[model samples]
Target: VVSEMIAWIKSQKLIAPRMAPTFYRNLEEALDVRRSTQSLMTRGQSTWKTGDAIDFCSNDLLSLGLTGELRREFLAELARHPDFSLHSGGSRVMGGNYDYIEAVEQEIADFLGAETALMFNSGSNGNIAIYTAIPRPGDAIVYDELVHFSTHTGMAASLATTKVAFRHNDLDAFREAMSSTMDSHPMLQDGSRSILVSVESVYSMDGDVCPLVEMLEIAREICPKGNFAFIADEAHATGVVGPRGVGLVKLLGLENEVAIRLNTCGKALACTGSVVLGNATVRNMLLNYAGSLVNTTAPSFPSVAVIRAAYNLMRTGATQKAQDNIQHLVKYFFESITSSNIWDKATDLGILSIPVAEDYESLDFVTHIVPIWTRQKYNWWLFFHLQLAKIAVVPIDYPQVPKGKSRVRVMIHAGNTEEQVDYLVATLCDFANEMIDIEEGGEKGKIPKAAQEIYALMAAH
Candidate 1:
């Protein structure tokens, strides 16, 4: 079998010929298992050349990139620096460090009300660096179960005494976990050792904002010695939430309480790279000890410039109108989804539904990421229906989300039109109506032709 696998790899033009036979065999077995279990997944790039789809799938919450705001600002910034070089030749401690980069870092630090800021090439690297560098061997980390995968990866490589997870957004569970963690590590309770609480301001899949204030209060109660550090990943919240989009911690006036906040530019900021906001000591730790940051070449000049320009827009209220438009669109989306004609039946039949139908109104800061729950088999049905209508969305299944909680994540943007919203709901209604007709046609267990076709499509992909 191994010899056959090696011959196959050697013969295939697409696969590398030098890949070890044992390694390739192992991967083949794993993929075969996934395929048999119908759990296989793949990634494909999207094309905008045709301009046929109304995008409701991307995390452009404020639509800065969609509306060309970020591009214009970036270009203008580039124009201002006529002599700007495209490359940063070395790491920060090496030739990659420059005066302009340091200046931009300070500017961001000042804007976010942090003692200092360090820029990383990506959010994941920034997170990995933080967890690996900050937490000592005796320290513990208690995180919300739904925090980003990067945080979990970093924690896995961390020196923390223990890593535990509590229920998402549950204060009682958090308190309980905190008590247990501190009890197990007596140094944490006495302020001799540190504990890190990790969470995201806006969860990507569930689209729910964290209860930062209540969580902070719980942490304080558990460790009054201030040995607990809060790490908030504002990946989905940056440039889209809080006062002037500074993020949840600053929005709640807990900047002094939170130890680290990571703001990425890839999402609402409409740029590249991420900035880690922290105190001087934390900055120094990451700068010197973080292998992810220290071993890699620093971000290029244009990347830093683009981030600066994005921040400038935030500082000058240039993106204020878009932010306001986002709020309007978010409210309008909820209203449209709930008021949809087939909403009741669709939900009743378990075809589709929102995560929290009634509690949205109570949220102080509602995010633009909306997760539409659907039956596992019907997830691709909803996705195909949307895709056929040129309304872009993807079906999120097990592993990305928990099993049996499959959903289609629809992210509303500032640039999304009201007509587009109406059409999306209408399409969902059509899907539901078609399913209703099929069930009522006395076909018993026979799936509809459209669903069958979609299932075939799923298998091919």
Candidate 2:
């Protein structure tokens, strides 16, 4: 421990407390609270370390990376640019501008049916750029409650007159939010100012598609002068939805309605970077005003080339096999699990369950993300059971979702075969049966030692 004088020096009113012992102590205290709450967070280790487990949690829904197609195409793309530079030297407006990059942007815009496209370092950077640079002081911003935290970060940094979030996928709540905003800010109805509505094509946690058509109908009716813009983040939908994976906006023929669309490559494309699609005017606005783009160096030649290669695959229908395979597996897994005999008993014991079949039917297409709900107390137990069986799945707990909404997020990848999915179903049934068996016993089942062991393993600081 340091002396009192050292502590006093650390507590000085001038410098930030970043390096002080008290700062670390406070962090430990907060982390301990998370640990005690049984909602602690940690990166996956076993599957990543051994690289032998059947992956059921990664975002590579199209399996482009797993099949080595992205790598082959990426190398081919780079080979064409014999004298390509590794670095952009500066931002796009300064030293980073190049004809090839512009050509790629045009290619992406054409592929997505957008008037223009601009590239960003990452999806979060694209989201931050849109929120911070657009929406002036008089405009209001409304978004779905369950959007990515990056959108929240951008909203927090934006200067929009009002920023509000309605319940996820709740049209009534959305209309209420719009009505409230309109009531308070008359300019929205007068066509003098606009409202920006933000949504995602697919929610990562809930695995449901947004009702964009219904949302647009409400917006137009409320604001007759059409003083609203919709921004759709198709990060998870890229290379996994729509014809040739162009994404939901085009799939629904609502390209002209959504003012902006953010398509990310890191997830399904197995590449890194993102492209923001919109009209030429929006591209110019972000180019001139978005600090995330204006102040940072442009994406490297290799990065842009990889994105081009991935889009090439999309344009040529190479990703269709993976997309179709994923849909088949999604249907298969849902059918198998829900048909299991112990499903009712396990759910009765508050051990395992899937989304209601009725709600499942509402999804536009069964997405690759399938959430299996479990009681919070048994969340880690199910995670350990899957891990012990060499299956890699993640247990998402509170703060990611509500307290009671804890779940094991099962991502069905295109690389995963029917036999692999069958193995997963069998493993899940075994875990559920075991939990149900123990629950039938006396009070001792309340805190099983195996459950305690896994919690200790997970919560180890």
Candidate 3:
């Protein structure tokens, strides 16, 4: 049956260029085993027994797990609201409007310096809500070419009248695109039209801050009559950057300038759910018009409580210690690269993107030693290997980003100690150096030099 299915799929040729399935096999040839003793469950139990473990792969920048006070606050909330429903009962527009939800929205608005705020189950939902709510039949959206897939998908689904992409981080290109679409296009010339500019506070893949201040200036200048809106996605920056982790927009004092801000609590805030900060009218419109929000289940009360507690702790400098740890990790990462003479190729940020090889064969070769690097040249396999080494990493790939833009997204969390950072840096340098030596020596048919070096370093450790 599997073979027949594969044959039929191949004959149809429905899949796109990069859409081939990585793991598919005939049912007869494949082993179908169900085990009750999976290591994830057992190993997770054992790992929990140990205290002070480092997790570099998690989005939890503030180390909320370590904060007893924060945990107590969550417990207190849960205890006080023992009747808190596991489900929201329905959408917020219906009976799902809990008082705590309003409180959360207000808190988010205050933190972001926005007039109002709305909650969404996730960042994807928030993006969709923004695009769906603001853009009318004759509207135009000018977005960064490298914007998140969710943004692209949501905008596409909205069936907006027109859409234009500008080069990533090119303010000039953005201005040109805006000028061409809003000014040059005859349909957009009328004062009745609305133009939306979408961007991120911190780019997830590149690990760089956006030019929010400059972008805001461009928006104001281009659409002087106030028909333009700037939407900043602070999914990565929330709870980590800015004063008291208010996010890059507030950090840079551009809060008043940005028309819409999407602040996600999942990443640095160490919680689930996201908030959309905008005007009161916009919030009300989203409640009524945003399809995703109107249809989806409201987040669990526990999740909301936890998010509130995390935010409360973040605002009070309880998470301030993580900043120093992040700085140390960055410094250590750079120093290791320099000492090993691989600084030229090394990358850094709160997340680091180290290049593997250019092709699948090279990636496979490199993975043999590192074993963590993936055969697909995506970093998920590498992430798994790091897990085996008791470290963690997030993988970046084509759909999450673009092809040939593969990277191992090393998140620097509050739980990662200086020693752990040192160890990670040293291991990476040693692996790279050894691989370079083998490649230089023209060794062939053996595990490629890069793979060998990674394997050797892992074995030593």
Candidate 2: residue 129 lDDT (0-100): 92
Better of 1 and 3 by TM-score: 1
> What's the C-alpha lDDT at position 303 in model 1?
89
Alpha-carbon runs more than 4 Å astray in model 1: 1-49, 437-444, 453-461
Give the per-residue lDDT digits (tens) of candidate 1, residues 1-461.
22222232233223333336788877766665655544555442142213567878776767787778888998999999999987888888777888888899999989888889999988888899988888888888999999888899989989886999999988899999999988887788779998899999888888788888888888888898988899999898877887777877778887888899998988888767899999999999998878888888988888899999999999998877777787788788788888877888888887777875556788775788888866677776676677667777756876777777778888888889899888987887788888877777898787755566655654444
Q: Candidate 2 lDDT, tens digit per residue, 169-275?
A: 99999999988998898778688999999999988888888899999999988888899999999998988889889989999999899999999998888878899
> By TM-score, how accurate is candidate 2?
0.90
Candidate 2 has an lDDT of 0.83
* Models ranked on lDDT: 2, 1, 3
| lDDT, each prediction | 0.80, 0.83, 0.64
Better of 1 and 2 by lDDT: 2
